[PDB]
Amino acid sequence: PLEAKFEEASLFKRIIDGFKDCVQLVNFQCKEDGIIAQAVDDSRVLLVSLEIGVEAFQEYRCDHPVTLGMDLTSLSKILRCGNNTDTLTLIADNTPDSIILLFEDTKKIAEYSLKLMDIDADFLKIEELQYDSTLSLPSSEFSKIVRDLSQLSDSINIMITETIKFVADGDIGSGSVIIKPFVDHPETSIKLEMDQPVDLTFGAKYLLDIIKGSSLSDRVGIRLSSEAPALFQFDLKSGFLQFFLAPKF
Amino acid sequence: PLEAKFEEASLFKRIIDGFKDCVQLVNFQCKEDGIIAQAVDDSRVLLVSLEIGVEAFQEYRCDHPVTLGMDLTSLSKILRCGNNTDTLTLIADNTPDSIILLFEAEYSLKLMDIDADFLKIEELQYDSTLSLPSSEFSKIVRDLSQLSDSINIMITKETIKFVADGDIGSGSVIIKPFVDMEHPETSIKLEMDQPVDLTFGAKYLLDIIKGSSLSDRVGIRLSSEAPALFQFDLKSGFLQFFLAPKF
Amino acid sequence: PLEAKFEEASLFKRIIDGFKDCVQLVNFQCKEDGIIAQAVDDSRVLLVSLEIGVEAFQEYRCDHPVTLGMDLTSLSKILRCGNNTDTLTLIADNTPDSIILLFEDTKIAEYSLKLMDIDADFLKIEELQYDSTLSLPSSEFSKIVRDLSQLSDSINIMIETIKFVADGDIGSGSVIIKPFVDMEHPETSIKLEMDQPVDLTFGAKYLLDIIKGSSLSDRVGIRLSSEAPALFQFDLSGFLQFFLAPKF
Numbered sequence: 001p002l003e004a005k006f007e008e009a010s011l012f013k014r015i016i017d018g019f020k021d022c023v024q025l026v027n028f029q030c031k032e033d034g035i036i037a038q039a040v041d042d043s044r045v046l047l048v049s050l051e052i053g054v055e056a057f058q059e060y061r062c063d064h065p066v067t068l069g070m071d072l073t074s075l076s077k078i079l080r081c082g083n084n085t086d087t088l089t090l091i092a093d094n095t096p097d098s099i100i101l102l103f104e105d106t107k108k109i110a111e112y113s114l115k116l117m118d119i120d121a122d123f124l125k126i127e128e129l130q131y132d133s134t135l136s137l138p139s140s141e142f143s144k145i146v147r148d149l150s151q152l153s154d155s156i157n158i159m160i161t162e163t164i165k166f167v168a169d170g171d172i173g174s175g176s177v178i179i180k181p182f183v184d185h186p187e188t189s190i191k192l193e194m195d196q197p198v199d200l201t202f203g204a205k206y207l208l209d210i211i212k213g214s215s216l217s218d219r220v221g222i223r224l225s226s227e228a229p230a231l232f233q234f235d236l237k238s239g240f241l242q243f244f245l246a247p248k249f
Numbered sequence: 250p251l252e253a254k255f256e257e258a259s260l261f262k263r264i265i266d267g268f269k270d271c272v273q274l275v276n277f278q279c280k281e282d283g284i285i286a287q288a289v290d291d292s293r294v295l296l297v298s299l300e301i302g303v304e305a306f307q308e309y310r311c312d313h314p315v316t317l318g319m320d321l322t323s324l325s326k327i328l329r330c331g332n333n334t335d336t337l338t339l340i341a342d343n344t345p346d347s348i349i350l351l352f353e354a355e356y357s358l359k360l361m362d363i364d365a366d367f368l369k370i371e372e373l374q375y376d377s378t379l380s381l382p383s384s385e386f387s388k389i390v391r392d393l394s395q396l397s398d399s400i401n402i403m404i405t406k407e408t409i410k411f412v413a414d415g416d417i418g419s420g421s422v423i424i425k426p427f428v429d430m431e432h433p434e435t436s437i438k439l440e441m442d443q444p445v446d447l448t449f450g451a452k453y454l455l456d457i458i459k460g461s462s463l464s465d466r467v468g469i470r471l472s473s474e475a476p477a478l479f480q481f482d483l484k485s486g487f488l489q490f491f492l493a494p495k496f
Numbered sequence: 497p498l499e500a501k502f503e504e505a506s507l508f509k510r511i512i513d514g515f516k517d518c519v520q521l522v523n524f525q526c527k528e529d530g531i532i533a534q535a536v537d538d539s540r541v542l543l544v545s546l547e548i549g550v551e552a553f554q555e556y557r558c559d560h561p562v563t564l565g566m567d568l569t570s571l572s573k574i575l576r577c578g579n580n581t582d583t584l585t586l587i588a589d590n591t592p593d594s595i596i597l598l599f600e601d602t603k604i605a606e607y608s609l610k611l612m613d614i615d616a617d618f619l620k621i622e623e624l625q626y627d628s629t630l631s632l633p634s635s636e637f638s639k640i641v642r643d644l645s646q647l648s649d650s651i652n653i654m655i656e657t658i659k660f661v662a663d664g665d666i667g668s669g670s671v672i673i674k675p676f677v678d679m680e681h682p683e684t685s686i687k688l689e690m691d692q693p694v695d696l697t698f699g700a701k702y703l704l705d706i707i708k709g710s711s712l713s714d715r716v717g718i719r720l721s722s723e724a725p726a727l728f729q730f731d732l733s734g735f736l737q738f739f740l741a742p743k744f
Contacts, residue, residue: 051616249442
């Protein structure tokens, strides 16, 4: 049928966690080459795209491509049953009415069934060829900056010249984090490639959701274009989780 | 290999009718989760995208994905043979030469080779998003079509204005969003990020409104420089029309 | 599992040759209806899309979709063994550790290519309507690009008139051609459909890679839109497209 075993349930847990607080219901297409999924939020201001490759699984077998509609709050609830390092394996049939999530801890074990639903899959490819600027920084730093400036206001501005400035201007005060590219410990390097400069403003509400993809990666990529939704990538082991966020006009 | 049974042939008939007279000839990709098909027209000003989910069928089985190239007029003519309550079943074998349409009389349509270049031009967010009775929309378009061959649309705050201007004269229809709690299917819905001013070909709008035979309501998403999207939702599915505006 | 035979390895050879020195590596998705592949260059200025239909093969059987990650230089090297008249047959198994390229003649060599893991994030940037769509003999086009790329590293296009103009340090040059229909030889006719006029400047070095695709087709299609990447297509039951981002 279909069976996919995460060596540690922790991974799939963190993966769902990342876009859990973003969107509501989501379609999961499982193909021969692994699992892809996409969801757009309430206001259609934010899209989450997720690609999980075969080598992120301890084992992966999908004979017939299978889509799985899922309520994210439900799936998360089943995923808190958890116990982290334990082998989690999703199992679905040819035409499944439900997906089986099977936990095994090395001691012994539990099996759960999530009932799937029908969702219309209108899948978006809004990603561009070249974005005006492409930067990458430690996800932790980015997390900190967003969390700090989101104190001062609801709207955070990002400016790239070669200089990257983060600016919040509120009804209390303002704040500015200016950071510049360098190479060092490669995990801490701030990389920047700039074609034409960029000045873009985003809802902090959303950015705070985007940054909790920090649990999946050391580093975040950020690609920005003038008229386009900005793209925020957290790379997986053979995969990624990206957030497309439409700028404010 | 592939067998898909509509409860009533009337549905497939009305779908194909819906985007017939719009586009030329169309590639139908049948997968495990059902049928998607796309076609662009003569001047490439209009694209039809169709998704039919698995639960719009009385039953559906597709073992391996199969594409079916089809001449829309040929298929339509074969679909004229329908009793509109007869149970239509499409059938294809592993590498189809032809597709069998079975009414309950059996027909065969010989397939064509077409190039599969497929278009995702849909956008994340559109400036304005409205929805209204497909009937009302078809009326407005049909009326304004009389006065000129170019119909313009303006979304303001709570204002939606349709305006035609030509040699004969000038029409204007103005509707506002409202919630009718007696009958929710007639309620006019509108969401607006930025206002929009967009002109479209009446020739094309007239083709687009023919999809009103599939749905109570039509959604309309308008972005400022992007092709406007007109959606008629189905039972587990939809038929959408992407129409490029006028410069 | 997966078995695909080209009547002449010549074809697969010139296909890979076309985008070989353009892009870094490539992901080949083989499906029931045939092969598609996409690659972006390092500057992400140039995308190559490739569609090869079922009927570009002497025989084609793909039971279930299989993706094959490949190093282009490696593949090309294993394709240098081709006779250009030999029947090349690609073979891959359920989960593809390696692809088997099999050359055979009327008088047989079997090569194995180690497959890599590439993240496939595929782009659909193609538009509905392009401001201008023209088509000319690939021959002519390659000559024009080759000539103007002498005078400058930036070649400009202006569209019933099609003007190619390069202005560099040493000098400038202008080739102007107009749409015409030729009853004698339709393959040499230049066609133009213009909704809006277009003015676009491109990198010469990239256009020079793009014209390499001339070995695959009599004619090149060119679709130029104002803010968008221009689309250069060489047809094959299939095609090879080069999406090239204009310069600002």
